[PDB]
Design a protein around this motif. Sequence first.
Motif, mmCIF file in Angstrom:
data_model
loop_
_atom_site.group_PDB
_atom_site.id
_atom_site.type_symbol
_atom_site.label_atom_id
_atom_site.label_comp_id
_atom_site.label_asym_id
_atom_site.label_seq_id
_atom_site.Cartn_x
_atom_site.Cartn_y
_atom_site.Cartn_z
ATOM 1 N N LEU A 120 0.832 -1.199 0.000
ATOM 2 C CA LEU A 120 0.000 0.000 0.000
ATOM 3 C C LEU A 120 0.872 1.256 0.000
ATOM 4 N N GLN A 121 0.507 2.217 -0.838
ATOM 5 C CA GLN A 121 1.199 3.491 -0.935
ATOM 6 C C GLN A 121 0.241 4.635 -0.615
ATOM 7 N N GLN A 122 0.789 5.839 -0.541
ATOM 8 C CA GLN A 122 -0.021 7.024 -0.298
ATOM 9 C C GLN A 122 -1.125 7.162 -1.348
ATOM 10 N N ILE A 123 -2.273 7.698 -0.926
ATOM 11 C CA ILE A 123 -3.405 7.967 -1.814
ATOM 12 C C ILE A 123 -3.470 9.464 -2.035
ATOM 13 N N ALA A 124 -3.276 9.901 -3.282
ATOM 14 C CA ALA A 124 -3.302 11.326 -3.601
ATOM 15 C C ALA A 124 -4.664 11.941 -3.312
ATOM 16 N N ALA A 125 -4.644 13.200 -2.866
ATOM 17 C CA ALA A 125 -5.833 14.024 -2.856
ATOM 18 C C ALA A 125 -6.166 14.451 -4.274
ATOM 19 N N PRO A 126 -7.437 14.680 -4.592
ATOM 20 C CA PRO A 126 -7.774 15.269 -5.885
ATOM 21 C C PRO A 126 -7.054 16.601 -6.033
ATOM 22 N N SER A 127 -6.774 16.976 -7.275
ATOM 23 C CA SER A 127 -6.187 18.288 -7.484
ATOM 24 C C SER A 127 -7.206 19.378 -7.180
ATOM 25 N N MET A 128 -8.385 19.330 -7.810
ATOM 26 C CA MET A 128 -9.408 20.372 -7.652
ATOM 27 C C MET A 128 -10.629 19.802 -6.937
ATOM 28 N N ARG A 129 -10.799 20.196 -5.673
ATOM 29 C CA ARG A 129 -11.976 19.842 -4.893
ATOM 30 C C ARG A 129 -13.176 20.766 -5.119
ATOM 31 N N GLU A 130 -13.041 21.846 -5.888
ATOM 32 C CA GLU A 130 -14.196 22.683 -6.234
ATOM 33 C C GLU A 130 -14.641 22.262 -7.635
ATOM 34 N N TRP A 131 -15.516 21.257 -7.668
ATOM 35 C CA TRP A 131 -15.918 20.531 -8.859
ATOM 36 C C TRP A 131 -16.892 21.275 -9.743
ATOM 37 N N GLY A 132 -17.464 22.387 -9.290
ATOM 38 C CA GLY A 132 -18.371 23.150 -10.125
ATOM 39 C C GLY A 132 -19.795 22.629 -10.116
ATOM 40 N N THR A 133 -20.430 22.606 -11.289
ATOM 41 C CA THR A 133 -21.777 22.067 -11.417
ATOM 42 C C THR A 133 -21.751 20.536 -11.422
ATOM 43 N N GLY A 134 -22.929 19.940 -11.255
ATOM 44 C CA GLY A 134 -23.021 18.501 -11.385
ATOM 45 C C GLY A 134 -22.602 18.019 -12.760
ATOM 46 N N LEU A 135 -22.781 18.861 -13.785
ATOM 47 C CA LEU A 135 -22.380 18.472 -15.129
ATOM 48 C C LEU A 135 -20.862 18.464 -15.283
ATOM 49 N N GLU A 136 -20.162 19.436 -14.686
ATOM 50 C CA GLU A 136 -18.699 19.412 -14.738
ATOM 51 C C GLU A 136 -18.129 18.277 -13.900
ATOM 52 N N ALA A 137 -18.776 17.948 -12.786
ATOM 53 C CA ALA A 137 -18.308 16.829 -11.979
ATOM 54 C C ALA A 137 -18.488 15.508 -12.711
ATOM 55 N N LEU A 138 -19.593 15.346 -13.441
ATOM 56 C CA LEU A 138 -19.823 14.094 -14.157
ATOM 57 C C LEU A 138 -18.846 13.924 -15.310
ATOM 58 N N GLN A 139 -18.550 15.001 -16.036
ATOM 59 C CA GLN A 139 -17.551 14.919 -17.094
ATOM 60 C C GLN A 139 -16.187 14.537 -16.537
ATOM 61 N N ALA A 140 -15.857 15.018 -15.330
ATOM 62 C CA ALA A 140 -14.671 14.527 -14.641
ATOM 63 C C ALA A 140 -14.838 13.082 -14.190
#
Lengths: 167, 167, 167, 167, 167, 167
Positions: free
Chosen positions: F78-98
């Motif tokens: 087991l290794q370190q688990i990265a944090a997401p780069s951008m936690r301000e995901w925007g709209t639900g549509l931008e989050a789904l495309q991500a």
Amino acid sequence: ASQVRQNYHEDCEASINKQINMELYASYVYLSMAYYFERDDVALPGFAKFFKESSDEEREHAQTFMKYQNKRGGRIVLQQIAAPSMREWGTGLEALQAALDLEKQVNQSLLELHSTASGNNDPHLTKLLEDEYLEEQVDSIKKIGDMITKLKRHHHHHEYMFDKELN
Amino acid sequence: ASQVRQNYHEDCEASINKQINMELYASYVYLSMAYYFERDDVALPGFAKFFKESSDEEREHAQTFMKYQNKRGGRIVLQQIAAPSMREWGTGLEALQAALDLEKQVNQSLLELHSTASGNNDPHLTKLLEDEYLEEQVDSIKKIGDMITKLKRHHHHHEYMFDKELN
Amino acid sequence: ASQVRQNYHEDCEASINKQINMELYASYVYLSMAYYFERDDVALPGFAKFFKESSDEEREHAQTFMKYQNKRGGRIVLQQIAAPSMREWGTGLEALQAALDLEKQVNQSLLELHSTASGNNDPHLTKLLEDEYLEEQVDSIKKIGDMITKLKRHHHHHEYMFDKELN
Amino acid sequence: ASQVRQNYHEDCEASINKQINMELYASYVYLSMAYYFERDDVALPGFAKFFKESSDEEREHAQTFMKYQNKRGGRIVLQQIAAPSMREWGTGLEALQAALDLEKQVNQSLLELHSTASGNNDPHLTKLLEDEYLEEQVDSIKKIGDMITKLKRHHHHHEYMFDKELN
Amino acid sequence: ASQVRQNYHEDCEASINKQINMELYASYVYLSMAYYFERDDVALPGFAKFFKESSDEEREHAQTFMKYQNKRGGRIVLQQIAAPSMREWGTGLEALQAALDLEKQVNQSLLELHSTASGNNDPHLTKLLEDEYLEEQVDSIKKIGDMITKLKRHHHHHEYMFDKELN
Amino acid sequence: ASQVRQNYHEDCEASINKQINMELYASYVYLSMAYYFERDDVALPGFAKFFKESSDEEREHAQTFMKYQNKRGGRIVLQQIAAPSMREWGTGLEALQAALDLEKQVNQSLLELHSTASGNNDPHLTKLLEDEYLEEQVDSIKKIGDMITKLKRHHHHHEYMFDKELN
Ligand SMILES: [Fe+3]
Ligand SMILES: [Fe+3]
Ligand SMILES: [Fe+3]
Ligand SMILES: [Fe+3]
Ligand SMILES: [Fe+3]
Ligand SMILES: [Fe+3]
Ligand code: NI
Ligand code: NI
Ligand code: NI
Ligand code: NI
Ligand code: NI
């Protein structure tokens, strides 16, 4: 004015609003009594339950009027709710007597309001007053009169007993 | 003094009566809103239900403080319930924002009451506030918080859809 | 010392042991009252049952402090449990006034133990006292207060009727 | 004296009071043992449950004698309960071995109480001792003896498995 | 800032984010432990289940803080979760002994978080720590301590039997 | 090496460890999206619930690779688990495309891991990927595709209605 308004004299509208204020007031007075009888130096749980239930009843009576204000197209205007007449209502008997006077004061308002409705020829409002108010009023005056007469025997032991029958 | 009083500061007794009055007033305001949204020219049942239940909650809150006054030996001193800010509350979004404001005001009072009880060393009274008011307050603020965010989208068509999911 | 011990000041570990004794002492008083009201020249099964429940509850409140001592890494020290001074408790009203007095003693000790817990920044121990002791204590004190006010109404005939509604 | 007393020699009455005090002391010892076996550096839930039960058993045996004292017309006189010998009971085998000697101790006094009873020709009180005390005592001594030989076997592994079916 | 924020000092907000990250790290350690105890050359399903459960426990404790951060009006900032110390945890007794120190580690930070909370007079957040974190932590430390003394006894045969009732 | 190991090339044992990390990484992104859509200035319980389920599923997909590592004789690293780069995901549509982008990343890695498995003639491992990963991945990718097409319909009013049919 209002798309629903039909045959609703603005004198009747204003009397419903003033009557909404009174049921909230009587609701507030019964709420004082209800919790007065729960002090550790009073401890009459039957008088407390009896007045809690009246406090909720009178708050329902005010809401039926508010529903009615809208049904006919009037606009609810809520004034202040006056503080109750006392803080310490004394014995159960003294408590019931203020309630008896207070119930009858509400009756003389409800009968004046019915006079206002009958004069402006509002049969929908006389129907509301007879079926949902004037009957309950005469009934709760009679119930208290029975109670007052039963509780008059001085005695504190006799009151603790009559309390047990209100629970 | 009463037989049951112990570690109960008179400053705390007086805040709890101040708080009973704010709770009952808050209940009055939510009753105004509630039936304001039942008017024929407003016609939002989902909003009217929300402020009806809020007004019962606030009335329930004030009774728990009155039971508390008597629990500790304090003596309920009931005052006048002032009439609501307004009689017309606006769009649902304006009433929501008015609700958020009154909820954050009552929370300041409940947090002020908490510091008064910490200062006098009443841990029984801080446990009342932590377990029965501060949790309900913060939760309720966040619920109103979300609702304002969902209801800012202009349109009255958005309000009618959103209303149908308060219902 | 102990593998589990963490943030448990020794002046709290000692106040818990003194409190386990005090709870076992109160348990012993209620036991003596419980069978005192079962003597044949007393004959009050409602009082007897009341103080029997109160012995049991004060014993389990002792066992909760012992579980807690072990839970934090403390070491239970049990000492002798005093007999009551006066086992001839008199009427149910004199026994209850002694109950109220003792119930207020334990509250006093339980509040000191809390001020000891707060001064040592032990939020675990202040939570144990707030939930499991201060609440039951104020409740028990208020319930006994109500009983005394009810019972002092004089007559043995009032006590007998009061006793039957305590069963 | 009393209006119920008949054939209740006061030496019997005195040696029930003494026996009440002994039974409560045994309740205390087993309660000491019980919570010792829940120390995190002991950790045997089987022995903890066993002695926690014997603590209840013995406290009930005390109250049966208190009931008996009232039933016969003698007066209960409670005494200070002594603190247990240890508050660190050692291994499980040692604790049993202590308990065996305390149950053999309590048996000796119950036979003496019986001897006093017969010498005074109180057949009511010897029946009580035989049906309620002397017979619990022999199976209790036999149960504890069975356990001691089962546990003799050194090993902490063998005490851990014995402890599993005591649970 | 936010429309829900009230009495939420940003040092509290920052040290919830820190605590979120710690709880997720503990979830990771126990998850490392859990699947280690399912290696075919280790093969203890009792410890595997135990730590697999603690992994779920701790991941839920993280989300309760994330919920709390939103409930209060602070913004969640997640950080990289560190990899566990080992990825070979040794014997069962060693693994427990590591877990005890990690639960004692997480307890220290929760008390610090509480200290920050009180200093800032945030009674909402100390109630959260006491009801949801500080009390899980003490029984968790006591449960793990009980297990360690139960397991101390050398033998792989004795670890195989302890493991059977952990299952 | 391992008593169970058979036909398990080391380049598969290492791709499984890298994949356990990647699944734990994706789990972490969906967790951040999950509580992001629960902030009070976002207020989308359908999206939040969606990405909460997706975190849980991506975590259990990590635990299935760990069970598998142990099942074949491999050794989890087991290794370190990265944090997401951008936690301000925007709209639900931008989050789904991500989400779609990330879901296609994991598919890419899962397909490479399969080509690694097939080149080493490991029919056990190619079966693990076909059943338990490639099927869920193409399904999840298609379900998100449908959501995006539906959601891009612009209006926040469309997103709110779309969110309610996601709950
Ligand atoms: Fe009325
Ligand atoms: Fe409130
Ligand atoms: Fe107590
Ligand atoms: Fe016995
Ligand atoms: Fe945790
Ligand atoms: Fe996956
Ligand atoms: Ni009489
Ligand atoms: Ni008389
Ligand atoms: Ni051996
Ligand atoms: Ni063996
Ligand atoms: Ni449009």
